[PDB]
Amino acid sequence: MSGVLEGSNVKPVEAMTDMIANARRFEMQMKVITSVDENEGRANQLLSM
Amino acid sequence: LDAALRFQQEALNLRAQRQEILAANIANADTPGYQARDIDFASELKKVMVRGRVDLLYRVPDQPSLDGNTVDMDRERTQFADNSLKYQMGLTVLGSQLKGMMNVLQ
């Protein structure tokens, strides 16, 4: 079909929901990392005495 | 004679060797593909009592990691604490035997 151009098929709604999901997933992972760090911190006191 | 201290002396030496092994475990708790090791204290003590002056068995792993490393730090911490406590016990027992032998004497 001549006389016509074609744009990008970037669905903005799925991109928006993807970004929201990514942010929330990232911060859940950050909580996991924090808990594991502080666990190792507590546990490294077994080796004393 | 005076081989009445032999058992605890060899036990204490093997305890020191196991301390060294477990410290190596802790040190290499991050090197990829380490395959944590240990020794069986009872069997090695019996072997050194029957003959005198130690195969490094492999600690069976849990929880794979993709770096090959199998030092599972919690087990190593508990075992290190146990070994240190048993070493101090051996020190106290040898001390008591030597105290007794030098108490009877003078």
Query: Over the range B8-28, which residues count as b (16 or more CB within 10 Å of their CB) and which as e?
Result: bebbbebbeebeebbeebbeb
What's the rounded Cα separation, in Å, for the pair B83 and B88?
9
Which residues are CB-contacts of B4 (< 8 A; sequence separation ≥ 6)?
A: B97
Q: Is B66 helix (H, G, I), strand (E, B) or coil?
A: coil
Asked if B28 and B34 touch (Cβ cutoff 8 Å), the reply is yes
What's the rounded Cα separation, in Å, for the pair B67 and B74?
18
Q: Considering only residues 28 to 47 of chain A, which have any Cβ-Cβ distance to chain B shorter than 8 Å?
A: 40, 43-44, 46-47
Burial tier of B76 (Cβ tally within 10 Å: 0-12, 13-18, 19+): buried
Among A44, A46, A49, select the one facing B78 at the smallest CB separation. Answer: A46
- Mark yes or no for CB contact A46/B73 under 8 Å: no
Q: Tell me the technique behind this structure.
A: cryo-EM
Size of interface A-B (CB pairs under 8 A): 15
